[PDB]
Ligand binder design. Sequence first.
Ligand SMILES: *C\C=C(C)/C=C/C=C(C)/C=C/C1=C(C)CCCC1(C)C
Ligand SMILES: *C\C=C(C)/C=C/C=C(C)/C=C/C1=C(C)CCCC1(C)C
Ligand SMILES: *C\C=C(C)/C=C/C=C(C)/C=C/C1=C(C)CCCC1(C)C
Lengths: 228, 228, 228
Amino acid sequence: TGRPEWIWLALGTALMGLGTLYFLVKGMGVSDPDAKKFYAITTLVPAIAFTMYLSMLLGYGLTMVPFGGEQNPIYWARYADWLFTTPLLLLDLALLVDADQGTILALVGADGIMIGTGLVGALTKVYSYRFVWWAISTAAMLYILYVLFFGFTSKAESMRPEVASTFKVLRNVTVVLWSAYPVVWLIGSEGAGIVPLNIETLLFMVLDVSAKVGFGLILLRSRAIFGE
Amino acid sequence: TGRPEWIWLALGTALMGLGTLYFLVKGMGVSDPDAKKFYAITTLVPAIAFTMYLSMLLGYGLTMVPFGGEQNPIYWARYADWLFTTPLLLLDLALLVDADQGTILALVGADGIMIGTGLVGALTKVYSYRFVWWAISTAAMLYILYVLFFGFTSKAESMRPEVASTFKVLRNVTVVLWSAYPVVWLIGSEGAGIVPLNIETLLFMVLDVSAKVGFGLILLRSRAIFGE
Amino acid sequence: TGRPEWIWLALGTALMGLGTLYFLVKGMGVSDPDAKKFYAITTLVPAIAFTMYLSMLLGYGLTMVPFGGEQNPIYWARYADWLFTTPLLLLDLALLVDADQGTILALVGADGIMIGTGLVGALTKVYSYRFVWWAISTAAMLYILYVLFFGFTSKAESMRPEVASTFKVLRNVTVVLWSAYPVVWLIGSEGAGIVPLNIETLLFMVLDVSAKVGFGLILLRSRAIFGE
Ligand SMILES: *C\C=C(C)/C=C/C=C(C)/C=C/C1=C(C)CCCC1(C)C
Ligand SMILES: *C\C=C(C)/C=C/C=C(C)/C=C/C1=C(C)CCCC1(C)C
Ligand SMILES: *C\C=C(C)/C=C/C=C(C)/C=C/C1=C(C)CCCC1(C)C
C-alpha cells in the first residue's frame, strides 16, 4: 500500500529536488536566447517531478483502485507527473532538431494520448480492459519513437554535427528509457502483478530520475544548445 | 443508464478508429511544412475521440449525477473529448485563414469556456442552475461563430480563392454542426429530458463523427492546405 | 460553510461579469494586431473568473476537506480560476516587454507549480503538510516575481519609454497583489484559521477583482499596447 515503498518515494523526492537546484544555479550563467529555452525546459521537468514525488510520499498523490477483486493502491500522481514532463522532453528534442510545428503538435498529441490512456488503464476496475488501454498507450509511444527516428534523426543530420550527434545520443537514450516504462507497468502490480508495488515504485523512481535529471545532465552539458 | 446505448458507443468507437487510421496512412504521402500541420491537427482529433468513445463504451467515461430527484448517468468523457478536439478544429480554420495570434487565443479561450461550462451544467445537481450554465456555454459558442463570420471570413477573402472558398464551406459546416450540440443537450436527458439517453447518445455520435471524420475528409481532400 | 460568504461570491460574480462586458465592447474599436492580443488576453481573464465565481456562488466550485479533525469547506474553483488567469496576466507582462520564449515557459511553468501546489495544500488532510505546500508554492511565486524584476524590468527599459513605464507600474501592481495572496491563505481558514472563511472569501474577492478587472483597466487604458 503506502508504507513499504516510502524510501523510494523519499529518495525520488530528494533526487528531483537536488536536481532542480543544480539546474537553477547552472542556468544563471546563461543569456543566449536559445540556451535559455533548453534551460527553462530542462529545469522545469524535475521541478514538477519534485512536487509530484513529494505528493506521493506524503500520501496525497495516491488512490485505491478496485480490480481483480482487490483494493490496489494507484499512485495517480506518477501519471500526473508524466503528463507534464514527457511533452517537455519531446520539446528539447524538437528544439534540438528544429522540428516544424506540425511535427511538434503530432508528438505532443500522441504523448498526451499515451499518458492519458495509461492513466485510464491504471484506474480501470475491470481487469481485462486494463490491458486494452496499456496497448493503445503503447502504440502511441511507438508512434512517438517512430517519429524521433523517421522524422527527426533524418533532419538533425541536416544540421550542425554537434547537434546531430547530441540528438543522436539523446534519441538513443529516449528509446531505451521510454520503452522501459510499459514493460514495468506490465510486470508490476498495476498490470500483471508479477512484482510487488514495492519494486514497481523503485523501478519507476530509477527510470524517472534518469529521464528527469540524467537526461538533463547530458543535454545541458552539451554545446548543442548554443547557436555559436 | 449504460446498456441501451452501447451500440452507438461501439459504432462511434469503430468509426473514430477507422477514421484515425485512414488519416495516418494518407498523411504519409505528405512533406509540405504547412500541409503537415493540417494533417497533424486533423488526424489527432479522431485519435482522441477514439480513446474517449472507447472509454464510454467500456464504462470508464461515465458517472451518475443526482438531479430532479433522480440518478442520471452522465458521460463526462463526451465533454472531455470536446475539450481537446474543438480547439483543434478552430485551429484548422485559423491556419486556413492565417488568423492573428490575438484572435486565436480569443477563440480557444471562449471554446474552453463553452465546454467547461457545458460540463459544469452536465454535472450540476440543482435542476434550474443546469440551464444557467447551458446559457453561458451557448453564448460562448455564438461568440466563436461570430468571430468565424466577422473576423475570419472577411480575411479568407483577402487570401487565395481556393482557401477562401474551402474556408467558406468549412465555416458553413461549423455553424450547422456546432449549433446542433446545444439543441441536442437541451432536448436530451442531461437537459429537458424530452428524449431518452439512448437517442441522445446516438445524436451526439452522429454529430461527433461528422465533425471529427467528416469535416476532416473535406479539409484534407482540399488543395487549400498546400502553399502552391 | 457555504452560506455566510455568499454576498462576496455574488458581488464577485457581478463585478467579473460587468468587467468582461466592458472589455468586450471596448475591444471592438480595435484592429491593431498587437492591440488585439492585449485585449484578447485581458478580456478572457475576467470571462473565466466570472464562470468560476458563479460556480462558487451556486455551490458547484466547493468541496469539504477533513483536517484538524474538522470538516472544512474548500472553494477549489478559486484555485481553478487562478490556474488559468495568472498565466494570462504573466503573458500581458511578457508581450509588454517582448520577453523571449525561454523566459515565458519558465514563468508559466513556475506559475502552474505555484497554483498546483497551493491547491494540493488546500485539499491536504494532514495539518502540518498543508504548510509544506504553502511554502513550495510561495517559493515559485518569489521565483516569478524575481524574474519580473531581474529578467523583465531590465529589458522593458531597452524598449519604448511608454512601455517601460507602463510595465514598471504593472510590475509594481503585481508585486503587491500577488504577494497578498499567500498572506491571506496563511491567516485564513485554509491555513492558520486566524480569520473566518467569511472574511477569507471577501479578501480574495477584493484581490481577484483588483487583478482581473483593475489591472485590466490600467493596461487597456495605456498606449503601451499599440505599436505606433
Ligand atoms: C518522466 C519522464 C518520462 C520519459 C516518462 C515516460 C513514461 C512513459 C513512456 C510511460 C509509458 C506507458 C506506456 C507506453 C503504456 C503503459 C502505461 C505507461 C503510462 C507506463
Ligand atoms: C467534437 C467536435 C465538435 C465540433 C464538438 C462540438 C461541441 C459543441 C459545440 C458543444 C456545445 C454545447 C453548448 C453550446 C451548450 C450546452 C452544452 C454543450 C457542451 C453540448
Ligand atoms: C486571479 C489573479 C491573480 C493574480 C491570482 C493570484 C494568486 C496567487 C499569487 C496565489 C498564491 C498562493 C501562494 C503563493 C501560496 C499559498 C496558496 C496560494 C495559491 C493562495
